[PDB]
Amino acid sequence: MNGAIKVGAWGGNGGSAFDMGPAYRIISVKIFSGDVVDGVDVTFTYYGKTETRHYGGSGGTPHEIVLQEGEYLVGMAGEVANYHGAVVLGKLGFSTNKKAYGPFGNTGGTPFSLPIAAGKISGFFGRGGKFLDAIGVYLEP
């Protein structure tokens, strides 16, 4: 969009597109996983107000990443697997400039990794359905 850097769209073509848009500050990310990744719940602040978005499906169990002050999402990885005739993320994980999280999910598949040597993730986008078909990120310094 306006100087945005949207890298990704890892996963399958099913589901329906979702776009969080870049955030001003990602407060917390919650990954709901089961055999695969069900959805991602994101709480962030945009133009002053605190917002929460619900992506992917409603199933799965929550694993939350809370960004302490000065901590950012500097990496993302996982596996795009086939789950009952549907290409979705079977494993997903993130890394912060402080600790590493996950991966969350138990279905193996073709891997992908996005180690950020310089920059951070600032937002999310992708395709959702009964599960998390695909996920991508917004990058910024």
Ligand X SMILES: OC[C@H]1O[C@@H](O[C@@H]2[C@@H](O)[C@H](O)O[C@H](CO)[C@H]2O)[C@H](O)[C@@H](O)[C@@H]1O
Does an H or E element contain 121, and which?
A: strand 120-128
Q: Which of residues 82-111 bind ligand X (CB under 6 A)?
A: 86, 88
DSSP letters of 16-39?
EEEEEEE-SEEEEEEEEESSSEEE
Report yes or no: 35 and 107 within 8 Å, Cβ to Cβ: yes
Question: Distance between CA atoms of 141 and 132, rounded to whole angstroms?
Answer: 27
Q: Which of residues 17-76 bind ligand X (CB under 6 A)?
A: 33-36, 38, 57, 59-61
Per CB under 8 A, the list member of 28, 58, 106, 110 interacting with a copy of itself is: 110
139 binds a copy of itself, rule: CB under 8 A: yes
8, interface contact from a copy of itself, ligand X, none, CB < 5-8 Å by kind: a copy of itself
By CB under 8 A, name the binding residues for a copy of itself: 1, 3-10, 110-119, 125, 136, 139-141
